[PDB]
């Protein structure tokens, strides 16, 4: 898997590939790894798929509950705090390496969360098997002030590097641009038979039931 994120002017760009693997076998060709936490907060994950998915649902719903109660725009700091507390409560297990981006009152904030409960504020990060290739691209080309278009191009190139250099990564390129006002989730941002004769398969019995 390859997930990456970076902070551009007044926005956060997350990107991810679209492949899930049951080991050597490609189990899903169009999996979605960018996860909606709140309107201004998104997350992407690597590790045990069930852990990522259910931890993300838990965080999303808790954040919505908090927003309803406090009538205040959620905070990336709150999300990372809850996530770290939950991940630490389990002594390492429930492995979830998460790139958590958002835009709040304190601007665009990107965090990297380790499975053991450690968080890091970052300008750009990558996680997954293809993490090193995405990091190579980001390091080589990243710069402090970039437009949303430039951020999207950099994210796409990094994810493509991961896809075409990591065997565990492949498929489409999902990206999401989160701003303090809204988000756009470009799901397919980039996208790099026999008909048997009727009655060929023998049967032993047939039962017809009409609903």
């Amino acid at each position: 898997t390859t997930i990456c994120g970076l902070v551009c002017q007044n926005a956060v760009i997350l990107g991810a590939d679209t492949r899930a693997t049951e080991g050597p076998i490609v189990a899903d060709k169009n999996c979605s790894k960018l996860h909606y936490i709140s309107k201004n907060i998104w997350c992407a994950g690597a590790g045990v798929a069930g852990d990522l998915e259910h931890t993300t649902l838990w965080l999303q719903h808790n954040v919505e509950l908090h927003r309803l109660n406090t009538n205040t725009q959620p905070r990336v700091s709150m999300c990372v705090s809850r996530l770290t507390q939950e991940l630490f409560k389990y002594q390492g297990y429930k492995v979830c390496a998460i790139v958590l981006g958002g835009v709040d009152v304190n601007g665009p904030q990107l965090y990297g969360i380790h499975p053991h409960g450690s968080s890091c504020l970052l300008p750009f990060t990558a996680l997954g098997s293809g993490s090193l290739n995405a990091m190579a691209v980001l390091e080589a080309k990243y710069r402090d002030n970039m437009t949303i278009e430039e951020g999207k191009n950099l994210v796409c190139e990094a994810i493509c590097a991961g896809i075409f250099n990591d065997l565990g990564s492949g498929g489409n390129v999902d990206i999401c641009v989160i701003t303090k006002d809204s988000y756009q989730h470009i799901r397919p941002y980039k996208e790099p038979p026999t008909i048997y004769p009727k009655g060929t398969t023998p049967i032993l019995s047939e039962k017809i039931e009409y609903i």
């Binding site: 090193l132 990091m135 190579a136 691209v137 080589a140 190139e157 075409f164 250099n165």
Partner: protein, 230 residues
């Protein structure tokens, strides 16, 4: 050799218009201890073959001694410049060494890059070979340039550019994204320096004290080691 103790980090090698350019930092480590920082991790085998290593230093030095003996034997039995062993010969020799050690569960804990020029058709340096003392560069076809990778298990292959260690992730991405045929020396240096900067930033075992070696129509040139500009 139960495991690596003194380790050398990434090595990069590429083909450019005028030959082979191989870069490696001059650092050796003792675990997380940067104990040596002026170590020569690229070895000249003969006028047209050079050797880069990653991993244990003792095993790399043993292999370098073996290849030095082989080069001296070849020079002793040499009569014309075509009798000199090519880089491909030395690559096959190193592969056989690693395979035989794999069959004895006594591996060398190294990844080796054997690079050079396979042809005697671009110069006459080996008509009178000099071992103790050191026009324009002649354009060399990329087919006459050899770069061979070998790993602990003996996995041997060749390519237009090779990387070892952490370079196989960071440097290799840039190389595959940007490498092109018939590159000038300036462009090759720019690309390799960008790769080495990434490695310095993301590899804890890498150093910014670099060693660049060129294998060209005028033999093997060892550059002045330099700290990475920025």
């Amino acid at each position: 050799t139960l495991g690596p103790v003194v380790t050398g980090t990434s090595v990069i090698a590429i083909k450019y218009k005028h030959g082979i350019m191989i870069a490696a930092d001059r650092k050796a480590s003792y675990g997380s201890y940067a104990k040596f920082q002026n170590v020569e991790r690229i070895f000249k085998i003969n006028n047209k073959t050079v050797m880069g290593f990653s991993g244990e230093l003792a095993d790399a030095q043993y292999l370098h001694e073996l290849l030095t003996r082989k080069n001296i034997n070849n020079l002793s039995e040499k009569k014309r410049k075509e009798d000199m062993y090519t880089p491909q010969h030395y690559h096959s020799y190193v592969s056989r060494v690693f395979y035989v050690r794999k069959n004895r569960i006594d591996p060398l804990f190294n990844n080796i890059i054997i690079a050079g020029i396979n042809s005697q058709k671009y110069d006459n340096n080996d008509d009178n070979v000099l071992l103790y003392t050191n026009e324009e560069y002649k354009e060399i076809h990329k087919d006459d340039l050899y770069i061979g990778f070998v790993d602990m298990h003996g996995t041997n292959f060749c390519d237009d550019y090779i990387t070892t260690g952490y370079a196989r992730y960071f440097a290799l991405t840039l190389l595959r994204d940007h490498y092109k045929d018939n590159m000038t020396e300036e462009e090759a240096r720019i690309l390799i320096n960008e790769c080495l900067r990434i490695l310095y930033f993301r590899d804890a075992t890498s150093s910014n004290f670099i060693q660049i070696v060129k294998v060209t129509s005028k033999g093997v040139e060892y550059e002045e080691p330099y700290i990475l500009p920025c």
